[PDB]
């Protein structure tokens, strides 16, 4: 898009020609407070690495799921509570 006339094809401006624009992209550098950034970059910056994040996520999820499953109280889960009534006999007297 040269834009001077009804011309919309221009090899000089190929990003305009192909319509490769940023619709809402905003590049103002000032968003947050300095001390907020200090705190968040100090604490949340540990999880930046991605392979370590994968390993930590998998190990933590496995540990949490196993601990909750194996230590859940009977008053919460019915499967751990177990049966409380007398069993019912089968049709032909088969138990």
Partner 1 sequence: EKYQVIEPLNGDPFIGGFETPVTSSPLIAWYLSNLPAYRTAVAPLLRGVEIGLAHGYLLVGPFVLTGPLRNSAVRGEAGSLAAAGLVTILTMCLTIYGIASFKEGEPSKAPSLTLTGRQKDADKLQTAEGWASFTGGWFFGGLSGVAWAYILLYVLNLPYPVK
Partner 2 sequence: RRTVKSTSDSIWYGADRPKYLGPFSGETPSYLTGEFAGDYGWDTAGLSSDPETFARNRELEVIHARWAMLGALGCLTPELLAKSGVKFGEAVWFKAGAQIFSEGGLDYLGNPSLVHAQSILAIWASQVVLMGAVEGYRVAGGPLGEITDPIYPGGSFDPLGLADDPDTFAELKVKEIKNGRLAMFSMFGFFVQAIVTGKGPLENLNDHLADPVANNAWAYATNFVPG
Note the residues at the interface with partner 1 (CB under 8 A): 1, 3, 8, 13, 15-16, 19-29, 31-32, 36-37, 40-41, 43-50, 53-54, 57-58, 60-61, 64, 68, 76
> With respect to partner 2, which residue has the nearer C-beta, 31 or 92?
31
CB of residue 66 to partner 1, shortest distance in Å: 13
Q: Which residue, 53 or 66, is less far from partner 1 as judged by CB?
A: 53
Q: What distance lies between CA 15 and its chain's CA centroid?
A: 33
Q: DSSP class of residue 17?
A: H
Phi/psi region, residue 29 (left: phi>0; alpha: psi -120 to 50; beta: rest), is alpha
From residue 21 to residue 40, what is the string marking binding to partner 2 with x (rule CB under 8 A)? --xxxx--------------
Distances from the Cα of 41 to the Cα of 18, 34, 36, 72, angstroms: 38, 10, 8, 37
């Amino acid at each position: 898009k040269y834009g001077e006339k009804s011309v919309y094809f221009d090899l000089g401006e190929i990003d305009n020609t192909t319509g490769n624009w940023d619709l809402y992209g905003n590049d103002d550098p000032n968003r947050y407070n300095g001390f907020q950034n200090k705190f968040f970059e100090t604490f949340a910056g540990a999880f930046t690495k991605r392979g370590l994040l994968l390993k930590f996520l998998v190990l933590g999820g496995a540990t949490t799921i196993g601990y909750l499953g194996s230590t859940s109280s009977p008053d919460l889960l019915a499967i751990k509570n177990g049966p409380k009534q007398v069993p019912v006999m089968g049709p032909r007297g088969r138990k």
